[PDB]
């Protein structure tokens, strides 16, 4: 107006159907399926503990997080003879237990 | 035969070799010949190493 009140601008963003990604790469790129790290001898020859902390926008109702750890979930199907199926499964970083 | 005869990544085709070079040559030729109407090539997995 010729007579306003004042501005105090505020900003926000709203993306709704996407999973936030933190690729397990040195340069955060995806130059291949099996990433640069993971093949790293530090993360392959030794066991390492992991800790993650999330700071969030509070909401009154009880909700829950959902971290999907991106891994290799491969199954090999072998059928030697007639009517026999042997399938071996392997999830590499999180194997069964 | 998963951890003993082969490493696990090579056995599960996570990092070992491409399908065209670990399949039988006859199977590769058959897949190429019948790719137009039956498309065998989906069922086999490539490593795609970084």
């Amino acid at each position: 107006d010729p007579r306003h009140a004042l501005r105090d601008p505020e900003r926000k963003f709203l993306c709704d159907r996407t999973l936030w990604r933190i690729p397990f790469s040195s340069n955060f790129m995806s130059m291949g399926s099996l990433t640069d790290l993971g093949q790293n001898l530090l993360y392959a020859n030794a066991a390492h503990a992991l800790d993650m902390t999330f700071e969030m926008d509070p909401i009154n109702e009880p909700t829950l997080l959902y971290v999907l750890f991106e891994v290799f979930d491969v199954a090999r199907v072998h059928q030697p003879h007639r009517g026999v199926i042997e399938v071996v499964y392997l999830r590499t970083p999180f194997s069964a237990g | 035969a998963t951890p003993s005869m082969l490493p696990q990544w090579s056995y599960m085709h996570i990092a070992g070799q491409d399908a065209s070079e670990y399949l039988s040559p006859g199977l590769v030729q058959f897949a190429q010949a019948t790719e137009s109407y039956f498309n065998i090539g989906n069922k086999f997995r490539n490593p795609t190493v970084a």
């Binding site: 130059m31 | 491409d18 490539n46 795609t48 190493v49 970084a50």
Partner: peptide, 20 residues
């Protein structure tokens, strides 16, 4: 150096964009 950096394992150079 060793034959440049490796490529992701499994005209290239130049652009000719013009006209307006």
């Amino acid at each position: 150096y060793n034959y440049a950096a490796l490529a992701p394992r499994q005209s290239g150079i130049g652009t000719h964009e013009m006209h307006g």
